[PDB]
Amino acid sequence: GNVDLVFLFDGSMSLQPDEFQKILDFMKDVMKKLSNTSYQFAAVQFSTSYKTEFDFSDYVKWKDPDALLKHVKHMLLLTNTFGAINYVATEVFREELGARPDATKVLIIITDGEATDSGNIDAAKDIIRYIIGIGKHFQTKESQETLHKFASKPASEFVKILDTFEKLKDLFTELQKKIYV
Ligand SMILES: CNC(=O)[C@H](Cc1ccc2ccccc2c1)N1CCC(=O)N(Cc2cnc3ccccc3c2)[C@@H](CC(C)C)C1=O
Ligand SMILES: [Mg+2]
């Protein structure tokens, strides 16, 4: 069947330029692996505020990850994850922007920190949510457990903690045959 998948990617001030580029390259690798499938993609950068970098209609038009992410500018602010998830649920999964009514809705969140805001994500209850937390901010179990509230359940299946940004490519290499769900 059809999957509408959104990447919600951290553009916070804690990321070095090299680290931000590794997030971009990962999204590109995933999209390239799934080209010519029934997946459709959108990407949203989040920091203090939220920007749709490309929507589903854009993807269908260009089908070129490198082209679609060429103009991305690193926001360099905070990490308002609650607001970001709500923004995706209400502003991105919209028929007008190319979302398909019949499709399974999936959100992949990539982040290097705890949320600096609060709230709820009731609006996103129907979206399958997979979270990748990267780096030293998730060294402790307590910080890791803050991500469980954004993820689908059970957390053991929907939260992945990576110690370095190099692990994005390593895990892609290791597990790429599993991506075509
Ligand atoms: C059955 N497939 C999986 O479990 C893979 C495993 C995987 C493979 C590559 C990875 C690369 C970096 C970090 C983590 C990775 C994890 N898996 C995890 C589970 C998941 O929910 N999704 C999201 C997803 C993707 N497509 C779906 C289609 C239908 C229903 C639910 C769906 C859920 C993806 C996430 C991955 C691309 C980071 C995934 O392939
Ligand atoms: Mg950060």
Swiss-Prot record:
Tissue: Leukocytes.
Glycosylation site positions: 36
Entry coiled-coil feature ranges: none
Subcellular location: Cell membrane
Residue ranges occupied by any VWFA domain in the UniProt entry: 4-175
Notes concerning its domains: The integrin I-domain (insert) is a VWFA domain. Integrins with I-domains do not undergo protease cleavage. The I-domain is necessary and sufficient for interaction with ICAM1 and F11R.
Quaternary organization: Heterodimer of an alpha and a beta subunit. The ITGAL alpha subunit associates with the ITGB2 beta subunit. Interacts with THBD. Interacts with CD226. (Microbial infection) Interacts with SARS-CoV Orf7a protein.
Family: Belongs to the integrin alpha chain family.
Protein name: Integrin alpha-L
GN (gene name): ITGAL
Residue span relative to the full protein: 153 to 333 of 1170
